Design a protein around this ligand. Structure first.
Ligand SMILES: *C(=O)/C=C\c1ccc(O)cc1
Length: 125
């Protein structure tokens, strides 16, 4: 497994050398989003969590199509402000109840090394 801890202070240099294949090795759910909210990478751990099929989520919009739960000032509002400022590093708890049993999760959003690209990390609590 990829021995990287949730909430690490350097996760972005770490998940830079990783391919999608190496991303599944993560002990937590990893989601990469472009600046518009579209999904570029989805990890199986995220899949084990949300039940969504990684292959069928890449290319879609997280806020609009896949996970309407984050369409609130408490998640999306933070993502949009983070994109606008070009710097995001925030952690919080949330509920994912769209087309699924209400599952309590820990969320960590951070700006990736790359210019317009953002990480979403999730792990059950
Ligand atoms: C609300 O967010 C429900 C579900 C959900 C589905 C997929 C992903 O990635 C997160 C959350």
């Amino acid at each position: 497994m990829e021995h990287v801890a949730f909430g690490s202070e350097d996760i972005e240099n770490t998940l830079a050398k990783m391919d999608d294949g190496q991303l599944d090795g993560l002990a937590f759910g990893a989601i990469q989003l472009d600046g518009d909210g579209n999904i570029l990478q989805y990890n199986a751990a995220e899949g084990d969590i949300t039940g969504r099929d990684p292959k069928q989520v890449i290319g879609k919009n997280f806020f609009k199509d896949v996970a309407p739960c984050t369409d609130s000032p408490e998640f999306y509002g933070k993502f949009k402000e983070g994109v606008a400022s070009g710097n995001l590093n925030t952690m919080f708890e949330y509920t994912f109840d769209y087309q699924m049993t209400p599952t309590k999760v820990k969320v960590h959003m951070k700006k990736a090394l790359s210019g317009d690209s953002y990480w979403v990390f999730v792990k059950r609590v």
